[PDB]
Amino acid sequence: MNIFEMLRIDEGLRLKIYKDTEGYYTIGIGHLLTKSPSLNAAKSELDKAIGRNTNGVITKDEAEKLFNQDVDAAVRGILRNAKLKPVYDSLDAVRRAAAINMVFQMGETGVAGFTNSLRMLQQKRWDEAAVNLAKSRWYNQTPNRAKRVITTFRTGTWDAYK
Ligand SMILES: c1ccc2[nH]ccc2c1
Numbered sequence: 208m209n210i211f212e213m214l215r216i217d218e219g220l221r222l223k224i225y226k227d228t229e230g231y232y233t234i235g236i237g238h239l240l241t242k243s244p245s246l247n248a249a250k251s252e253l254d255k256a257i258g259r260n261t262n263g264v265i266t267k268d269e270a271e272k273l274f275n276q277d278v279d280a281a282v283r284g285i286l287r288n289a290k291l292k293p294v295y296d297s298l299d300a301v302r303r304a305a306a307i308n309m310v311f312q313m314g315e316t317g318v319a320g321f322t323n324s325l326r327m328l329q330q331k332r333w334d335e336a337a338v339n340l341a342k343s344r345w346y347n348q349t350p351n352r353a354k355r356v357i358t359t360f361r362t363g364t365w366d367a368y369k
Pocket residue numbers: 285291292294295305306307309310318325328
């Protein structure tokens with residue numbers, strides 16, 4: 208298992224514009240297009256990203272392309288983040304995957320707000336971090352996905368994904 212396969216399971220794959228769990232226009236593998244309530248604005252954002260007049264639909268190759276870009280950007284953002292980087296550096300490979308999954312989902316900002324959990328993870332207090340992580344809007348809104356990621360940090364294995 209790896210980050211790509213992990214996120215592919217968490218996000219699914221859709222080739223037509225759809226609304227995410229928060230009601231935002233998205234496409235492909237979790238690629239958020241816009242927070243605006245406007246489908247037009249979303250189709251324009253789509254065309255701008257793909258580089259063609261898509262008409263709200265993309266191919267699988269174009270989806271995988273957006274996905275590669277988004278994964279790379281997430282990692283790169285973590286590495287540029289002074290709050291995140293040190294935590295990320297302290298983790299083992301499996302757990303780094305869980306850290307990227309959270310950023311992919313909620314943004315660097317969203318994550319930066321889990322200050323207490325990050326500090327526990329950095330200290331390798333796995334069980335306590337898992338409990339603290341669960342006390343969040345994230346966990347209450349997307350419980351099954353949160354549980355998988357939390358299990359990952361708790362155990363350092365891919366068990367939740369097998
Ligand atoms: C960097 C980015 C996201 C993260 N989530 C938990 C730890 C961590 C570190």
